Ligand binder design. Structure first.
Ligand SMILES: [Cl-]
Ligand SMILES: [Cl-]
Ligand SMILES: [Cl-]
Ligand SMILES: [Cl-]
Lengths: 438, 438, 438, 438
């Protein structure tokens, strides 16, 4: 019987909480969602509501687009279907974290805030654990949201400059320890490290930082914003947890799962602590990020997600081979950034140094040609963000040797993304050089 | 011409940013949304994306249900359509705040966090303005999210007990000032007052608190979670701003606009300050709450929203008349709470005092009968929430004179909500009394 | 339990096949549709298809918009869900025919052809019953589809001119009988009469025609295209069946049920005959009309449909009162057409007779002003349709005394339809008269 | 600019009426559909409607699922958007007919009836051209809809038995001519031939029939129900038109385009004649089939459709290779039917002849195992359909030599359709043989 086959799939999901190997048909998915929504009190046929939060909906377009899930999520029930939705979604995500390369993950939850505010929530929770602490030690990465996250939480970021090793910018482990000793471990809220990042920065030395955190008894929060899509980044987290201390790692829903911006996952190795972060959240929250990742994971299944991850690696190879060929044809080179598995950079030395803002102009030319996501990084940008002045802003160092153009192979990239980029970049560079050579 | 008529409506919205008097047809609305989405780079036909946040979507169900808005909202652009969506939505909401009764509002923004976290954001911003402050003075209201909001922000709530005046619980203005003097104004982050609330508590004495805040130079943040739907609550805020100091007022999207849980509006009278709160938010955020309230307001228009507000007042009268008749028929009474325009309470003295947990049982019986939102409040509940032990928890006082049942006429209530509630309550009370009388 | 309440509604529908008194919520409706679609083989999870009609769908937009019903309808099964959909829909429609005023209806079915082709199907079936017959006797009504229906079926229409009685055009019963006698009853395929029609024609004298058909042993097919919405029209059919012979009556889905054009209902009093018409249909047919009327009737319920019918009568009174006031203010009059319960006409004598095509111009002016559905009927139109030349075409007579403007109160009409029409008509008439009076 | 790129695609479609080489994004498609719907009067913001067919819609679910196209299609305008929809759709389909292999097609139109009723419409039109004719000469194919089509139209089918040539059943050209001479050409309405059909019948000898029709001056209507997906079938039609007479060819929308059952395309080589068939249709008709094929073709583009056609050929090879291997492993054989490009048959001699209804049982076993579309054809079925008794019904001959199982590779078939079929068939045959061998 037709209906029993759908029931079987739904039952296997409910009982184990695991991502199905193969993706569900849309029919099964919508049957499931409609069944869950029926469980929420706002949807009961016999319901009468006499409170201030009844999940009433004025617009049919709004009700429908959300599959009639109106009550949001929490951490007798007013929304039994939404609670089941939350629980299942968190189970699927824990599973996917394991699939992605952190097999020893203990606990996780979706929070419908993006990664910056999600990091803030971790810091807000740590405040109560460490009431003496005022500082967050942070290996520099020129991205405003993660920097702000510390200031928003009410802490003083201690910016640790990176080391130039060949073309790569890497964790200055000695500088990290020197600041710990200077300021006093009891005065440090946590170390706040970062995995996936713009080349030529690479993921932080998490093994070594984890040892430092263990030894000094300082919490360690990892900004894994877009590292979940990378088995290399995820292995770093796993290894870090094996050899030292990692208290939480945070990742974007949109960047790793191809869903709208708005949600993140907070995960860790100590269940009581991760639950403490969740409990620190005041009030109900949007169910929309959770619904998006639930639909996506059930539709892809383990196989579909694994396929995307494999395809990302394949596209990274393709982008790298194509960008290196282009670069060399224009007497540039691909920066040597073997430790960055997602992001890469070619030099822009041939257009830089003419005192004409050509590097910045190139970024603009790419944008006008409907290339999104490229970063043309010039030398000497100065920018002040929330009390800190960054010299060499965009380059994660005060004195990076050259200007460069940064592109990345993130999950969902297609051959046409690479091919169009290369075609357009070639044209733009030819235009700039023509203009510069009279 | 057909198309020009739609264009006219869209143009009038874009140019002025005001809520249309009469609601748009769905056709016009969807034309508009499709046009905005086209403006976002992820939707360009000629786009190639080479970054880590390209707004790629794996599931067609996810893409469609969000009208192809994937990039989220912020405070060259990657998402021009989403930015316009954000700007328009905030304009419409400012307009509606004026319509609702705070005509002098200067600035506001939708934040896709619910009201508890939105209050936290206000507190997080005030930390930087007042680095010496550790305390938040807070007239007691037994609701976990707003209490937590203070603790989550990293501040110590100073719980001010309420005064019993007749049947009402009201602001203890003398106790508020005594704590200000005891602790020192410079040590107070803000006063955190509350408008709409469970009867028999009533909205705080905002005029008087505003004078206190002005005189002591202490910020004043108003928890207006579900007060926007009440012209009486909104007038209180307006008057408060006229006679003293109010720095921010926060309201729920779901409770005042009949949309899913997940978003709130932060509003105030000083544009630089409100903008400072917005700037304190790290990173991009979900566009989903904004889209929901945009669809809702364009669909209702000013007239449709005004109608809902009028209907709410009419339903409050109906609920009050019906509940008083029921109460008196069971030898109970309607508590005299004229200062609460949304929430009301009947006594439960006839079932209380038998040492059998009958009051709590009644709440359970109502819930099992698909009555949502009623609160059966017994005497003597003790609960500890985030470091504070509340005696008489649920009753907003240690020693409220009697047990009671609390129901409310919130926006969107229907006659059947009242009628079914009354029918079911009558039956439940008859059952309990039968059991108690052997 | 929430789910059981939905099940109860679905079970009551499946067991009895009756229209629910009150309309279902959308949630219940979509649960039901999803459950039915699951029953169709194209939707089985374990299905493999090795035939030429597997219900495969290339576009997700197409699959979704049809609720995954792909197999169409017929009169072991490949589409058990679609067959149930067909059966239920026909049951609901039979019920509604009774509600609408033909209580003695025996059998009916939805056919996804519009009313003209549906009449053709009746004629095609009668051919086999009456192989000697070549003629269809037809009281004139100037509407191309019903006229064509006879020619398309391969029969010769015998056009019976109407009688002028006061302002009304009515059935010429003597002319009908004279043609029967002249041509011979055995040579007449059927009499083809019409109920709802453009004023000042009125519904045919069905009682008297039914007696004629009974006495001469000639089938009687009633064109009830838009009469189902009228209890007066429906009573005429009922009475006709009581006092004489009516073999089939046909009505539009779109005109009586506010759904897209495309379907009709064939109904009658002799089940074997109505089933013979259904059996005459070759092959599978679209399920889309049936799905539309099923969704509509379940959503309205008996109460919602009854309400629309009552509202139509109320709007007819309003349109008549408003149009008479307008007419008289312009020195015109409302034609006296008490026997037409839907359609009415005001005279246009004041603009006619200037040899300037003013009547036709008025129709054009109304159309340019976004008035749809009005008919400005001039004198002296000659048009040939499928072998017959109609003099006075549009007026259902060769020599109707005056030009007129025809408007109607059909199901779903709103006060604004009347008010805008009246406002626009007033302006147009003033313009024409100004132009004509130099 | 983003919007201009969509406009470009829409403009190129409107100006030329051709299928885009590459498929449109959904965004472009929905923009286009919303724009067309805006053009229909029921959707005008300023519209007032005072007629009986205003396209009013009671249910939002119905309005939305049809993209607000309510007025249907025809052959001043009430539905300018629907008329454009009809015109464009017919243009795209003409284009696709050329792509599919009838390059010389002159005219075509979508009719929202399935293929049986569409053939009826052709016959109904021919009646008026040939008022003396009563007979339709028809090479036998055991399919009820196409047989009925002739009877429904009011004509007497003259069933021409097929010739056994090897394993194939083919057109008996001599028998066709003998009947023409016996009955008289002037008494023949048309020859009604068939292309795609169940093996071991093969497509009719259209070249030879076309010569016969030309020479005798008898119209020729081709039942191309599921031949459009086959370049071999389409070439036969093209060649037939080149060497003789073909007046119309009819094909299913669902079987060739992977859309819901309900529509067909009537096409031919003489524009006035094809237009005469269209003009014979009385009244408005559903727009739903046209919308489905429009969405499908714009979404696939020429490339996507070409790909499906290529994939069908590839799947036919796979099905044939797999079914032959299975058959031979069970001591059966694949019937030699090289002239049938879609349908194939393996023998069932090993289970036949035990007087136990095993062949029919096998069909039932396959059906119970969720194999759809297989046909287990036994010897000796007698069935009477609309006045004709077919001996050997299902086998297209009175005395086909053996029982067989018929499977087909139609458009949209997947490898899993073949693989599951083969796995299930193997099991079923093993079960039957076990039962038969005690
Ligand atoms: Cl990797
Ligand atoms: Cl109020
Ligand atoms: Cl009536
Ligand atoms: Cl082929």
């Amino acid at each position: 019987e037709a209906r029993r086959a759908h029931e079987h799939l739904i039952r296997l999901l409910l009982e184990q909480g695991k991502c199905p190997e193969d993706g569900w048909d849309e029919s099964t998915l919508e049957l499931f969602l409609h069944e869950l929504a029926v469980m929420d009190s706002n949807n009961f046929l016999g319901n009468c509501g006499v409170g201030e939060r009844e999940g009433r909906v004025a617009s049919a377009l709004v009700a429908r687009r959300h599959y009639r899930f109106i009550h949001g999520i929490g951490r007798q029930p007013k929304a039994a279907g939404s609670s089941l939705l939350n629980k299942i979604t968190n189970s699927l995500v824990l599973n996917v974290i394991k699939l992605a390369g952190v097999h020893s993950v203990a606990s996780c939850f979706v929070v419908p805030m993006a990664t910056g505010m999600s990091l803030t929530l971790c810091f807000l929770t740590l405040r109560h654990k460490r009431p003496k602490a005022k500082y967050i030690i942070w290996p520099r990465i020129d991205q405003k949201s993660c920097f702000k996250s510390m200031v928003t939480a009410g802490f003083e970021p201690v910016v640790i400059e990176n080391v130039l090793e060949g073309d790569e910018l890497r964790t200055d482990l000695k500088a990290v320890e020197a600041k710990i000793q200077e300021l006093g471990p009891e005065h440090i809220l946590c170390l706040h490290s970062t995995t996936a990042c713009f080349a030529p920065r690479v993921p932080d030395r998490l093994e070594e930082l984890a040892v430092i955190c263990a030894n000094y008894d300082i919490p360690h929060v990892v900004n894994n914003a877009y590292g979940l899509q990378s088995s290399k980044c995820m292995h770093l987290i796993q290894q870090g947890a094996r050899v030292g201390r990692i208290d939480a790692f945070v990742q974007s829903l949109d960047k790793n799962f191809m869903v709208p911006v708005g949600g993140a996952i907070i995960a860790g190795f100590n269940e009581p602590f991760i639950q403490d972060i969740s409990k620190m959240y005041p009030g109900r929250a949007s169910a929309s990020p959770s619904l998006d990742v639930l639909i996506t994971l059930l539709s892809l299944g383990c196989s579909g997600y694994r396929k995307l991850l494999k395809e990302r690696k394949e596209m990274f190879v393709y982008l790298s081979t194509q960008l290196k060929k282009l670069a060399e044809a224009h007497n540039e080179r691909l920066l040597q950034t073997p430790h960055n598995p997602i992001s890469l950079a070619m030099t822009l030395k041939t257009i830089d140094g003419h005192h004409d803002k050509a590097v910045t102009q190139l970024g603009s030319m790419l944008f006008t040609r409907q290339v999104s996501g490229a970063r043309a990084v010039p030398l000497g940008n100065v920018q002040t963000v929330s009390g800190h002045t960054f010299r060499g802003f965009m380059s994660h160092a005060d004195n990076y040797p050259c200007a460069y153009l940064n592109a990345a192979a993130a999950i969902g990239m297609k051959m046409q993304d690479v091919d169009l980029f290369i075609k357009r970049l070639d044209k733009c560079l030819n235009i700039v050089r023509k203009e510069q050579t009279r």
